Design a protein around this ligand. Structure first.
Ligand code: SF4
Ligand SMILES: [Zn+2]
Ligand SMILES: [Zn+2]
Lengths: 434, 169, 464, 380
């Protein structure tokens, strides 16, 4: 309904508090990250795609109830967020391509929502010139427009409006004899029009992003804005719920079954390696110990678990208390943070501390070879079509979507109903299903 | 060629000042041009003789924790180098054997300096660098990468009929 | 671009500066390392034509502290597979010469185990085992007395030191001068130990000569000083970079230090790369104000006091059981005390104390040097380190946001889980009169936060 | 800020004394050299003859520090943060043996116009707080001052803070039953209403001990909005420090105890028969700032980016008002009449205030002609 579409131009000249500056950037990253996931898991013209994207847009407050024209809260949030997020993604070329790609899907979706009458006003308020024609002229040149149209079968000329644009602006259409031309003007339907609009927006955005990276030295001096420029996708999750603290009740005699039914693949492999060799290296110990803390183990239970597992390795009981109890006791407590007290997230597992030979930590979908991953999935009692889907997803660098598919097929459901970005979240959603 | 250590940042100035303090005869013999009055500079004093500083050339050619003569011998030459503190120099004048130690130490440093130059091949390398760039040998021994390559570009533009920038100051 | 390519082939870039790149390979076969190295060569040289990378060397082990500050095992390749590993250190010299024999002996052991060829789990176990024993030995007095002697050289006459009282070696030299015969002068060295007198004086003022240690009975060696101020700095400067080891952990191995030690721990050192209200406001100082009637000190850390059913506004009843005065009545005094508490932190920030980042230096100064390194001001005591503010602007900003947060009843009510409990107490304690009282205390902290401190961000300067 | 301060003062000093060139601090030189830098101590304590260091400028020495040996220096006067030009010997490049200390040069005086010579004789009254005894809230000295103002009917009255002292026992123990702001407005209203019949203009200068105001130097003017149309013509709020032109006469106003800070950390060669206050005042006038000392006192907040633009002397003032905890005085230093009236209340007993006459004489004469013709420090 509303005029939420904008060609992002004329940077804001306002001033904002630091809290709003951080919140807008985080929210925009969340929105753009979920647009890509929706695009990967679905197609652009289904009911599910539209419904989920619209619900998410409602949730993040980027289009909602009205206000006095200028300080329209969602419009203002959208504008400031876009221009803030340009700085983060201007640096690298791979980041630039990602930002350009994801910022056009949202514009396509928003243009798909406009009513049939507001498009002309939006176009006129846009760059310089787009015009529509009345039904009289449309019927006057109906046959010629139909003949000039491409090889699309039949004479189905519905009620969709037809726009007249200067021929040069429709270059990519008229050099192939795919539009009707009359006195320097081309008559175009809606689909090619939105294609032209998207191409122009892409060109302008690419120009602006290329220009922004030039003048970047002027913000890097700010100490408050260093977490924005460098680390908006690095190792901290965009928004995380499964954290330290929390409540839970887990019995020690049940971990064997929850390993088969509830644990994600990474924790499954760590648990198997620990139960087989009676030992784990430093990375595996940290990852699996933090995971076990997240799901509801207590200090006494953790000490008992690790001690009872490490005695079978033919060591002296007292050596454990002398050397390994200290780290476990340190983990559950006070300061020394950011790697020692917070359970690992999916992004941190994926993009940091790659395993070596003899190491069983990391993400299976990322560090395992496709053949080895295939054999791993076969031992998991997975249907061959599921392996074909998962390996296809993995090849496209979408590891977490592959893990989502694994969750769905293991629990025998069509859709998980969530976006996975943390192993503890994988355990919690699995326990919720029961 | 005169080889020394910390010549360009100490000994050359001290020597030139002590020469005119006691009014030594014919200071100009330090150079190659007969001159009457001396300036108050150092590079102009010894015209005709190129001075090689082992401290300056070591930085360009090798990486060390410090570029003192004691540390230079330890890394390049692999040999200890004892030091005499400047406070003790007075107390070595009271006996013949002690004052021969001071003379012996002085002689050894001169041979140590000559050894570091030959191992690093400073002299053959200076000739080759100068011939490629096309500048004055005394200037490349003093130091300064920019001055050397400036002459390389200057030669290139001249042979291709160009107007070159005037020297700035 | 090069960094992106290397991380795509499952390799880690641990440093790179404009003429060098350090790459972690996770490989143990040297033949594979060169094969892996030549693959990076072709990858970069595929996109460009003239720029070419070249192999420089191989390290079998590394301890990356900073640029030109590391301990590594360089590989010197012999014929056909075999090599010789050479110990190589740079930038690991301590400027101070006032360390005891026990501290220097411990320091060489830790560096010695690091440059071994064993795995990480073996190194940490050996280091932890030794440090556990050392703490035990010190407490039982099994260490010889001569191990604790410290020697420092005077540069001036003792009566010309401005810091006088805060310098342990000057304090002893003053006692030597006035008590007996021979007189110390500039250039002389002084030997001293730190003992317990029962006089509560500072560790700088409890310095005694070694002779007086056995000659006198009422004094004994201060084990707390040597464990925390002598042993810990030397070990921590090497073992902190190791993953899984933290400065608080070393203290735990050595005694009953950790809780007190973590108060003396740092705040910026944890910055390796939003946060919750519980973890964001954990180093901020609680608001304290005595009761005008009974005098008992009151602690304010949240809007509500208690948990579950019996949770009430913190400003409802006095903490003293015998006192029946409501702090909500005494609102003017609370607001006045707030203002007094904020000028304290603003003045503390503007003091300008800088402290060196090196654990063995820790130079404290209020004078900002005009010689800057790449990171910040360059320390004038040890010429290779950067000074850092003792109280940063982020700590001052977070402190004022904490005062605004313990009096914000508006935001503390939407934070409640169930909509039924929020209604039950809003009609019970939070009368419209009560809501107005919290608004006056909240606006006191907001005046100081309003336009100052750059909680504000200027977008006009940021984009244009 | 610090670099620009050093370079500007050094450039002006080089222009005045016509020296040839400055030498880097770390460069050895057997002949005598002329160095430019700022004085500082090598530790966190009090400066003395043995702990002096000189820190150079960025353009020449790139911020290097060297020790300074003052054994061979006959007469000197040094405090931390002083931009100075030394001449000495530095043979090794790690220590300077100072031999000559160039004297500082002050700013030119204000140049009167033709209008400024047509003004008539005026009387000015000056008082500084606190305006109440240390054991009471009654504010009796304030009422006595108001009575004196009403009796004398001067032309201008300058009142320095604090009006609500931050060090008062009742303030610092929070025994007051009213907000600080309300008490401050009460005091201000009492002052303004009580001197309405006099017709004398009122100037209020803030202090760093004012509890309700911002504790950062330099300070902005006081906030007061409850003024009628009549009172807006007689009451004026200025900052701290301030330069005030009163009938073509330049007044330098500062509330900070600069005399008590500079004198606590200043070393000199002569101690038997010398005037400390005159020497400190000469330092103040030749350093061209309202606070030359760096680092400042332990409890003294300074914002340097604003200190650079709002706390510089524009010219050498005709009269400099410098309230302080030291004994009251009036001294003529370098053509400037420096007046210290003291605090109006000292402990549990009363203090003093000051009165001045101003009238600018004829243009021509023996160069300097002080517009201030009579000063008197009087008990309250
Ligand atoms: S995607 Fe995340 S939860 Fe799934 S296996 Fe990888 S790290 Fe574990
Ligand atoms: Zn009480
Ligand atoms: Zn330091």
């Amino acid at each position: 309904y509303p005029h939420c579409l904008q060609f992002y131009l004329q940077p804001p000249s306002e001033n904002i508090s630091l809290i709003e500056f951080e919140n807008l950037a985080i929210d925009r990253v969340k929105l753009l990250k979920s647009v890509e996931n929706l695009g990967v898991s679905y197609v652009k013209g289904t009911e599910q795609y539209q419904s989920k994207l619209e619900s998410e847009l409602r949730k993040l407050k980027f289009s909602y109830r009205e206000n006095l024209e200028d300080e329209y809260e969602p419009r203002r949030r959208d504008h400031i967020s876009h221009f803030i997020l340009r700085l983060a993604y201007c640096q690298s070329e791979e980041l630039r391509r990602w930002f350009i790609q994801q910022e056009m899907d949202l514009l396509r979706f928003r243009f798909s929502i406009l009513p049939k009458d507001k498009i002309q006003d939006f176009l006129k308020d846009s760059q310089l010139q787009f015009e529509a024609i009345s039904d009289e002229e449309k019927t006057l040149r109906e046959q010629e427009i139909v003949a000039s149209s491409p090889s699309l079968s039949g004479l189905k000329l519905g009620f969709e409006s037809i726009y007249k644009i200067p021929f040069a602006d429709a270059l990519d259409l008229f050099r192939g004899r795919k539009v009707y031309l009359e006195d320097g003007f081309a008559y175009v339907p809606l689909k090619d029009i939105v294609a032209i609009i998207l191409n122009e927006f892409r060109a302008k955005l690419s120009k602006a992003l290329a220009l922004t990276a030039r003048s970047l030295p002027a913000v890097q001096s700010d100490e408050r804005l260093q977490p924005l420029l460098n680390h908006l996708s690095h190792s901290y999750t965009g928004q995380d719920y499964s954290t330290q603290g929390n409540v839970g009740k887990i019995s020690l005699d049940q971990i064997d079954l929850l390993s088969t039914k509830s644990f994600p693949p990474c924790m499954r492999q760590l648990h198997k390696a620990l139960r087989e060799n009676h030992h784990l290296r430093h990375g595996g110990r940290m990852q699996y110990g933090l995971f076990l803390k997240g799901i509801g183990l207590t200090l006494e239970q953790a000490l008992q678990f690790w001690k009872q597992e490490f005695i079978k390795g033919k060591m002296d009981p007292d050596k454990f208390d002398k050397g390994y109890s200290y780290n476990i006791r340190h983990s559950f407590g006070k300061e020394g943070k950011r790697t020692d007290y917070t359970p690992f997230s999916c992004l941190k597992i994926i993009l940091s501390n790659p395993p070596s030979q003899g190491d069983y930590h990391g993400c299976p979908f990322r560090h395992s070879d496709p053949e080895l991953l295939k054999q791993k999935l076969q031992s998991y009692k997975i249907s061959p079509g599921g392996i074909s889907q998962i390996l296809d997803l993995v090849k496209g660098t979408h590891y977490q979507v592959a893990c989502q598919k694994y969750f769905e097929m293991i629990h025998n459901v069509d859709d998980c109903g969530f976006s996975l970005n943390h192993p503890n979240q994988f355990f919690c959603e699995s326990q919720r299903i029961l | 060629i005169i080889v020394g250590h910390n010549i360009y940042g100490f000994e050359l100035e001290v020597l030139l000042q002590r020469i005119n303090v006691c009014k030594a005869p014919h200071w100009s013999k330090i150079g190659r041009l007969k001159r009457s009055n001396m300036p108050k500079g150092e590079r102009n004093a010894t015209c005709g003789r190129m001075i090689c500083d082992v401290e300056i050339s070591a930085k360009e050619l090798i990486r060390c924790k410090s570029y003192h003569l004691s540390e230079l011998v330890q890394q390049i030459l692999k040999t200890e180098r004892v030091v005499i503190p400047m406070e003790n120099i007075q107390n070595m004048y009271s006996e013949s054997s002690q004052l021969l130690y001071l003379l012996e130490h002085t002689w050894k440093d001169a041979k140590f300096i000559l050894q570091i130059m030959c191992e690093l091949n400073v002299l053959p390398l200076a000739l080759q660098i100068t011939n490629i760039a096309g500048n004055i040998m005394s200037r490349t021994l003093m130091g300064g990468r920019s001055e050397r390559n400036e002459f390389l570009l200057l030669h290139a533009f001249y042979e291709n009929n160009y107007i070159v920038p005037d020297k700035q100051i | 671009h090069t960094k992106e390519m290397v991380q795509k082939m499952n390799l880690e870039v641990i440093y790179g500066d404009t003429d060098s790149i350090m790459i972690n390979t996770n490989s143990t076969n040297l033949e594979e390392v060169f094969k892996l190295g030549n693959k990076v060569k072709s990858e970069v040289n595929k996109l460009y034509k003239l720029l070419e990378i070249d192999i420089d060397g191989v390290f079998k082990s590394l301890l990356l502290l900073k640029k030109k500050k590391y301990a590594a095992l360089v590989v010197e390749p012999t014929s056909d597979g075999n090599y010789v590993t050479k110990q190589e250190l740079k930038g690991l010299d301590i400027v101070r010469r006032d360390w005891c024999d026990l501290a220097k002996d411990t320091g060489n052991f830790v560096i010695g185990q690091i440059l071994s060829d064993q795995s990480r789990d073996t190194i940490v176990e050996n280091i932890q085992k030794r440090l556990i024993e050392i703490g035990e030995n010190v407490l039982n007095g099994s260490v010889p007395v001569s191990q604790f002697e410290i020697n420092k050289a005077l540069t001036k006459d003792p009566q010309d030191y401005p810091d006088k009282k805060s310098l342990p070696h000057v304090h002893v030299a003053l006692w030597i001068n006035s008590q007996g015969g021979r007189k110390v002068k500039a250039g002389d060295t002084v030997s001293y130990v730190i003992c317990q007198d029962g006089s509560n004086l500072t560790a700088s003022q409890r310095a005694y000569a070694p002779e007086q240690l056995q000659k006198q009975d009422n004094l004994t060696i201060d084990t707390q000083y040597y464990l925390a101020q002598q042993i810990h700095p030397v070990v921590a400067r090497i073992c902190e970079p190791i993953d899984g080891i933290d400065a608080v952990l070393i203290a735990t191995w050595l005694g009953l230090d950790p809780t007190q030690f973590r108060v003396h721990h740092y705040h910026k050192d944890e910055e390796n790369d939003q946060l919750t209200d519980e973890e964001k406001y954990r180093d901020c100082e609680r608001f304290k104000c005595p009761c005008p009637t009974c005098g008992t000190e009151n602690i304010y850390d949240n809007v509500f006091d208690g948990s579950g059913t019996d949770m009430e506004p913190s400003l409802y009843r006095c903490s003293n059981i015998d006192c029946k005065a409501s702090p909500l009545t005494f609102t003017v005094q609370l607001s006045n005390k707030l203002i007094m508490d904020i000028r304290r932190f603003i003045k503390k920030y503007y003091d300008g104390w800088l402290i060196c980042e090196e654990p063995t230096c820790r130079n404290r100064t209020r004078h900002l040097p005009l010689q800057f390194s790449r990171t910040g001001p360059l320390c004038p005591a040890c010429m290779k380190a950067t000074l850092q503010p003792e109280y940063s602007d982020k700590s001052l900003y977070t402190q004022l946001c904490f005062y605004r947060y313990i009096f914000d009843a508006e935001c503390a009510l939407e934070k409640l889980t169930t909509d039924h409990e929020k209604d039950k107490l809003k009609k019970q304690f939070f009368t419209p009169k009560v809501l107005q009282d919290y608004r006056k205390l909240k606006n006191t902290a907001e005046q100081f936060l309003s336009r100052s401190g750059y909680s504000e961000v200027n977008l006009s300067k940021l984009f244009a | 800020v610090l670099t620009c301060k050093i370079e500007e003062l050094g450039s002006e000093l080089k222009e005045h004394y016509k020296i040839e060139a400055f030498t880097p601090l770390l460069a050895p030189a057997q002949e005598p050299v002329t160095l430019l830098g700022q004085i500082g101590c090598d530790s966190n304590g009090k400066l003395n003859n043995k702990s002096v260091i000189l820190e150079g400028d960025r353009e020449h020495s790139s911020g290097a520090q060297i020790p300074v040996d003052l054994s061979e220096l006959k007469e000197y006067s040094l405090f931390p943060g002083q931009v100075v030009i030394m001449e000495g010997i530095n043979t090794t490049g790690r220590k300077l043996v100072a031999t000559k200390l160039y004297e500082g040069v002050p700013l030119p005086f204000y140049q009167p116009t033709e209008e400024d010579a047509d003004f008539e004789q005026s009387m000015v009254l000056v008082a500084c707080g606190p305006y109440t005894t240390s054991d009471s809230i009654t504010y009796d000295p304030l009422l006595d001052l108001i009575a004196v103002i009403n009796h004398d009917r001067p032309d201008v009255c300058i009142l320095f803070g604090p009006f609500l002292d931050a060090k008062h026992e009742q303030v610092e123990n929070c025994l007051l039953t009213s907000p600080f702001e309300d008490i401050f407005k009460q005091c201000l209203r009492t002052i303004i209403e009580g001197t309405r019949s006099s017709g004398s203009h009122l100037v209020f200068v803030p202090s760093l001990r004012d509890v309700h105001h911002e504790p950062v130097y330099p300070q902005p003017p006081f906030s007061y909005s409850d003024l009628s149309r009549e009172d807006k013509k007689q009451v004026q709020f200025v900052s701290e420090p301030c330069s005030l032109s009163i009938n073509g006469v330049i007044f330098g106003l500062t509330s900070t105890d600069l005399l008590f800070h500079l004198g606590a950390e200043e070393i000199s060669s002569s101690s038997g028969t010398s005037d400390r206050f005159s020497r400190i005042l000469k330092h103040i006038l030749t350093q061209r700032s309202y606070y030359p000392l760096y680092p400042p006192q332990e409890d003294m907040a300074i914002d340097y980016e604003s200190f650079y633009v709002y706390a510089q002397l524009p010219v050498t003032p005709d009269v400099l008002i410098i309230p302080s905890e030291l004994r009251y005085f009036v001294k003529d230093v370098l053509g400037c009449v420096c007046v210290n009236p003291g605090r109006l209340t000292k402990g549990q007993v009363g203090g003093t205030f000051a009165r001045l006459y101003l009238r600018r004489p004829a243009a021509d004469g023996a160069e300097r002609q002080s517009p201030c013709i009579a000063v008197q420090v009087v008990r309250i």
